[PDB]
């Protein structure tokens, strides 16, 4: 089974490079061209380039200059880099490969790498309590960077009424994100929750209990 | 003795069960006498209660509850002084020493128990419990206590021992003619004050006793009522201060002695400090600090701010932080020392995106008055523009310059607006340089002689491109007249390095009070100190010779010996244990009331009462 | 350079009705266009190549036709798992290019918030600032308003929102809204509430603490 698995940064800061490894199994490189496209959000999706098979390469107009793809058929490896980075470079960025031979629909998809292009350093969030008075009841993820953060609940054994949401940008630069669940409010006195919050990018993790 | 503090969670469970236990034990293994309280809860069966053989007194109280254990050995315990209670007015109380399991505390031997101080007793819930209800505790408990007592007693997990023909009315703690009640309270005489070794008027306790006693002497109580102090018990450890007849003033009384529980020691136990009123307690409080005198430990009431010291800029929290900043400054609250650099930076005031950091309100900088000592450096990039002097390190005695700003500088005051740098009290710079530039309004640095400050060889002065010596000069921008020719840190007289007369606290003055002002002053080594308070200011003569009330020229109030006081002593302690008490005659001199002016006399003899 | 033009921007539909996209060419490109499907936080999905070819592991509801400059995607019949972003790619000029897609909402009855407010946390205050959070919970459609009132003042320009995508099984929105103010602020005024309008509301519904 064709898969890619992609591996590389979070973080890069302006004017230096990007890196991202793309390791694939379930088939050969030495007969599959390897392609490389992005999303932004205010972008949607956009074509970078591609080795095939062959060893050559072929790089969209905008990157042809800072742009480097190279591979290891042996290692079944493609290595992406990008170099002079700033902050309209930042997006998801994914390797692909196509259905068939020599074409361009992308049937197989790296699962993406996030990278931020920012000048600025990582933080690790401060979790605060969103208590009730059904019931609601929630965490608030403050002040972290950069993305992504993750949360669970009780460990991931209530994911019933759970809604977290879309981060936002926070004016000091930073974000900031809630996660509430609602239960019956006859759960209050008798069932403990907690948030489990985990920021990879700064190995930071906490676990929140919430009561009145 | 050995002593133990105790704890205070009552009710509280501590993790779990063994978790728990094991705290139970590390706190009073070995344990002789509890300071505080005795709690023993939510011991298992099978767990062993044996180290609490060792305990023969808590002061504060003692608390049973939740115990399965079917024994709790507290078989020495003499003494509960109650200090404290639990709930209400109980001073013991056993309760609810059973589980769902229907198994529960059997034997309470306190054959010991002989004195309940204060408070009174609580049982309730114990199905298991044995013996227990035989117990006269008239004998034990004050009579106060006697109506706010709470004793349930109802055996229903198993069948118990029965006591001893020995046992006075059949009154036991458990099995064994040892365990039978021992009563001292009583079956004394009509004639006995308190305690008793026996019914006859012969065996009778002195009055300083509880529990009870092998003689009748204050030296032979089985538990002070009050205190001990080595073998005799006494009302209050002899005090540490005494009147003296012969000098008139308060001298330490050479058999004086310190309060430690309920005990009088002569040097506190290791670790513990003494207090301002003689106490012995582990640690100092927030407003002093601890010393050494005459190999005591001593607590005394800090000066200024009690010394504080903190990390500088890149070490501990401050790790990685560029400078002084929005976020790290709340952390120099009450620092009177920085182990390590001060930064300053531009980046301060600007704020800083790249490290999410707000910009700084000026007037946190007032954070920083504490700081007496910077072993680092101190650099200085920024200041608020409307500020004329450098006011945050007003109180800043020393800069130690271990480390130095490129290996080079111990103190860098760059491009500022300031027009003064306002470092009064910067006694010294150990070592590295001291560079000041690009401060267009700055006027005074010159007239500083840096060679005074600097503590090593090799330390050099750079002052340029700062306010023109001349504009300096031209603007009136120059030292105070009462300054010394050894330069200021600004135009105020206490901005001066030295006196070119006196001074007064930090102030330079031209002249001390000494014969007109209404603090009446005199001069030591160019120094302006306050006359006694007590010394009554003199019409063109000087009004005191020194400190204190014996160099008064004349008193104010009224004279004891020597000395001029406010008011005659009275009421204070003396020899002999007695109170001292004075009266103030026509020439408004204290003498001596009669021994019989039991509350004072407001003249001699008995006539006076 | 060859545009993909992809209509509408947000295409609202029932479920098991039929759901046509539009992705036009700039132009005429014959059938080198191919669809994919992307699911919130998922990889782009290959839905049809070529216009109208089946692709192996696709559901049979998803058929693609045209030819020329407008080329469609359909989904006779709509389901819940279909909610997503779905994207044309040109093949025919280089650079390959995708267009900016069409996402697709589903209908349902109209359905009132649920709505919560939440003061900052004691914790929150120990480090100088409180947000406040409004939290609408399980709404549709998605337009909503929050009002943030502070002693029967409107704030403004001191509140961020932030909305869920569309709900798996009840195909809801829900809406967190945080007020922002220093601990001073915070502390200077009384009433703080909440305001809701929305149209399975009969009047604006406000929810408040001092
Ligand atoms: C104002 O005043 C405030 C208060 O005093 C100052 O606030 C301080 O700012 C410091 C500097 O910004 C800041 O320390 C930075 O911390 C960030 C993030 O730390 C967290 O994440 C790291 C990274 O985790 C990942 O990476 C490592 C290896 O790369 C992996 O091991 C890990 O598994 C992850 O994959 C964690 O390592 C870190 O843990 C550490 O701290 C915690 C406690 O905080 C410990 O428990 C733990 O054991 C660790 O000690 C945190 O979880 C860091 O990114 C940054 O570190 C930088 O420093 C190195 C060497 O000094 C430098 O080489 C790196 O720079 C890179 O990034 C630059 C941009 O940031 C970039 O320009 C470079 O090119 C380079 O790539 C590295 O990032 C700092 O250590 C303090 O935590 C913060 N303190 C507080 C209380 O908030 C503020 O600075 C002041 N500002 C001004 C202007 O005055
Ligand atoms: C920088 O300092 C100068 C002098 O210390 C300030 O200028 C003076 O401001 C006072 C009022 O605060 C006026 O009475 C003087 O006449 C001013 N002297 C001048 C203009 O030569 C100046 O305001 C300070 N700069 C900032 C930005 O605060
Ligand atoms: C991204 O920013 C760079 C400037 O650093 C610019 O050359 C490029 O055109 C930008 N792309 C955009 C705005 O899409
Ligand atoms: C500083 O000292 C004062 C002494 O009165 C105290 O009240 C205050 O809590 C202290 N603050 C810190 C941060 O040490
Ligand atoms: C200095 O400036 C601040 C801010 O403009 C102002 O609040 C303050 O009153 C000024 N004067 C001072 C601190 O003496």
Redesign the pocket.
């Known amino acids: 089974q064709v898969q890619l698995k992609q591996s590389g940064p979070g973080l890069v800061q302006p004017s230096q490079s990007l890196s991202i490894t793309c390791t694939v199994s379930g088939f050969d490189l030495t007969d599959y061209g390897v392609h490389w496209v992005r999303q932004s959000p205010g972008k949607g999706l956009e074509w970078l380039g591609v080795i095939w098979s062959g060893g050559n390469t072929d790089y969209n107009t905008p990157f042809t200059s800072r742009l480097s793809i190279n591979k290891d058929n042996s290692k079944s490896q493609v290595f992406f880099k990008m170099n002079s980075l700033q902050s309209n470079d930042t997006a998801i960025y994914y390797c692909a490969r196509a259905l068939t031979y020599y074409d361009y629909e992308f049937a197989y998809w790296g699962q993406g790498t996030l990278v931020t292009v920012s000048a600025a350093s990582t933080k690790g969030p401060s979790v605060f309590p969103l208590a009730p008075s059904t019931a609601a009841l929630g965490c608030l993820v403050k002040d972290y960077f950069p993305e992504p953060v993750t949360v669970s609940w009780n460990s991931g054994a209530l994911t019933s009424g759970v809604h977290t949401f879309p981060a936002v940008l926070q004016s000091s630069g930073l974000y900031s994100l809630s996660s509430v669940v609602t239960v019956p409010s006859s759960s209050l006195g008798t069932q403990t929750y907690i948030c489990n919050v985990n920021h990879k990018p700064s190995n930071t993790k906490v676990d929140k209990k919430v009561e009145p | 003795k050995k002593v133990c503090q105790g704890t205070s969670n009552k009710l509280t469970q501590l993790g779990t069960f063994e978790d728990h236990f094991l705290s139970l034990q590390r706190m009073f293994n070995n344990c002789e006498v509890v300071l505080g309280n005795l709690e023993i809860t939510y011991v298992q069966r099978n767990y062993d209660l044996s180290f609490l053989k060792t305990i023969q007194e808590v002061a504060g109280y003692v608390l049973i509850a939740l115990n399965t254990v079917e024994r709790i050995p507290l078989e020495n315990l003499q003494i509960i002084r109650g200090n404290m209670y639990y709930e209400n007015s109980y001073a013991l109380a056993v309760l609810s020493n059973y589980d769902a399991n229907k198994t529960g505390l059997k034997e309470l031997p306190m054959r010991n128990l002989q004195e309940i101080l204060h408070g009174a007793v609580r049982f309730s819930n114990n199905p298991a419990l044995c013996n227990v209800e035989s117990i006269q505790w008239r004998d034990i408990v004050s009579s106060d206590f006697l109506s706010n007592m709470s004793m349930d007693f109802q055996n229903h997990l198993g069948s118990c021992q029965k006591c001893d023909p020995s046992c006075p009315n059949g009154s036991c703690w458990g099995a064994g003619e040892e365990n039978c009640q021992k009563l001292t309270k009583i079956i004394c005489a009509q004639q006995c004050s308190g305690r008793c070794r026996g019914k006859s008027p012969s065996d009778c306790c002195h009055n300083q006793c509880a529990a009870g006693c092998t003689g009748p002497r204050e030296s032979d109580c089985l538990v002070c009522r009050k205190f001990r102090d080595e073998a005799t018990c006494k009302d209050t450890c002899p005090p540490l201060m005494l009147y003296n007849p012969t000098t008139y003033q308060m001298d330490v009384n050479p058999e004086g002695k310190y309060s430690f529980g309920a005990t009088c020691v002569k040097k506190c136990p290791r670790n513990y400090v003494v207090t301002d009123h003689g106490s012995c307690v582990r640690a100092c409080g927030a407003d002093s600090y601890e010393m050494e005198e005459d190999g005591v430990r001593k607590c005394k009431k800090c000066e200024g701010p009690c010394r504080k010291v903190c990390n500088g800029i890149g070490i501990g929290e401050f790790k990685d932080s560029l400078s002084i900043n929005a976020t790290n400054i709340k952390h120099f609250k009450n620092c009177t020392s920085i182990s390590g650099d001060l930064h300053i930076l531009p980046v301060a005031f600007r704020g800083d995106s790249f490290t999410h950091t707000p910009p700084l309100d000026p007037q946190e900088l007032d954070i920083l008055k504490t700081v007496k000592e910077i072993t680092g450096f101190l650099l200085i990039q920024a200041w608020p523009?409307?500020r004329?002097d450098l006011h945050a390190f007003e109180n800043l005695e020393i800069i130690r310059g271990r480390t130095k700003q490129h290996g080079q500088f111990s103190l860098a005051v760059v491009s500022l607006?300031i027009?003064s740098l306002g470092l009064r009290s910067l006694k010294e710079i150990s070592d590295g340089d001291v560079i000041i530039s690009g401060n267009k309004?700055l006027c005074y640095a010159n007239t500083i002689n840096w060679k005074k400050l600097f503590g090593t060889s090799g330390q050099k002065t750079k002052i340029i491109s700062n306010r023109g010596e001349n504009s300096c000069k031209a603007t009136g921008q120059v030292c105070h007249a009462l300054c010394s020719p050894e330069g200021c840190w600004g135009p105020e007289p206490r901005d001066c390095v030295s006196c070119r007369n006196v001074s007064r606290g930090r102030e330079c003055v031209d002249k001390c009070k000494l014969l007109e002002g209404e603090p009446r002053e005199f001069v030591e080594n160019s120094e302006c100190i306050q006359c006694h308070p007590e010394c009554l200011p003199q019409a063109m003569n000087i009004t005191c010779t020194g400190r204190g009330p014996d160099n008064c020229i004349q008193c104010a109030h009224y004279i004891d010996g020597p000395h001029c006081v406010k008011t005659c002593p009275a009421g204070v302690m003396g020899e002999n244990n007695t109170l001292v008490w004075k009266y103030a005659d026509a020439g408004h001199v204290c003498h001596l009331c009669h021994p019989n002016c039991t509350y004072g006399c407001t003249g001699p003899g008995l006539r006076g009462c | 350079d060859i545009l993909l033009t992809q209509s509408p921007v947000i295409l609202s539909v029932s479920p098991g009705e039929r759901v046509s996209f539009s992705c036009r060419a700039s132009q005429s490109i014959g059938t080198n266009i191919h669809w994919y499907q992307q699911r919130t936080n998922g990889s782009p999905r290959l839905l049809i190549k070529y216009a109208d070819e089946s692709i192996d592991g696709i559901p049979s509801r998803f058929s693609g036709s045209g030819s020329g400059t407008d080329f469609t995607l359909s989904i006779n019949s709509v389901e819940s798992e279909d909610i997503a972003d779905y994207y044309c790619q040109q093949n025919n000029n280089w650079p390959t290019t995708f267009g900016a897609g069409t996402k697709l909402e589903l209908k349902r009855t109209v359905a009132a918030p649920s709505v919560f407010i939440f003061p900052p946390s004691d914790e929150q205050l120990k480090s100088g600032t409180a947000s406040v959070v409004c939290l609408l919970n399980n709404f549709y459609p998605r337009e909503a308003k929050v009002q943030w009132k502070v002693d029967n003042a409107l704030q403004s320009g001191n509140s961020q929102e932030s909305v869920t995508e569309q709900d798996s099984k009840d195909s809801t929105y829900s809406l967190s809204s945080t007020l922002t103010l220093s601990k001073a602020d915070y502390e200077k005024h009384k009433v703080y509430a909440c305001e809701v309008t929305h149209q399975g509301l009969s009047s604006p519904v406000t929810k408040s603490f001092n």
């Open positions: 523009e409307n004329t607006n027009t309004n």
